[PDB]
């Protein structure tokens, strides 16, 4: 019985991080999963062209970054770059 993946459990964990005493329906869960994949493509895609445009073979956090700045509206971009630059530095801390 095939082992189909999703983002479901992580959506949940983040839900708890923001609204601890709140739950979700399957129907809305699909929407959250759709949302994630759509956003993932759009950012990944932009990043991809960015590389090409600049005759370079690698999609780095930087490519991802500027992708985000083209894909997102002023404020939402702003925070996104934060969380982005943060988790990266915090990652490069640990090893």
């Amino acid at each position: 019985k095939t082992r189909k993946e999703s983002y479901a459990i992580y959506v949940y964990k983040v839900l708890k991080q923001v609204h601890p005493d709140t739950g979700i329906s399957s129907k809305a869960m699909s929407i959250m999963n759709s949302f994630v994949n759509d956003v993932f493509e759009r950012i990944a895609g932009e990043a991809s062209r960015l590389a090409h445009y600049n005759k370079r073979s690698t999609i780095t956090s930087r490519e991802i970054q500027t992708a985000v700045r083209l894909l997102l509206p002023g404020e939402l971009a702003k925070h996104a770059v934060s969380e982005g630059t943060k988790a990266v530095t915090k990652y490069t801390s640990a090893k």
Binding site: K27, S30, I31, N33, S34, F35, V36, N37, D38
Partner: protein
Amino acid sequence: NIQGITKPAIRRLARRGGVKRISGLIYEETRGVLKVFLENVIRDAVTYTEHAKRKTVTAMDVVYALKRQGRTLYGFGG
């Protein structure tokens, strides 16, 4: 078949649409409109099925079609 899209159904959609008053000729116009819509979406959909060598049009063919057409839909395996 097409006329299966009932006047009252079309009326409800326009209500959710914010519309107060509806001309008679609208109903039929709506139908051509809706038809064109499905056609294009189902043409693209089927093309995905034809290419997937399946006799069963999936949700993902639909979903891929709506993307193609810039009418992205969430909640059927994005």
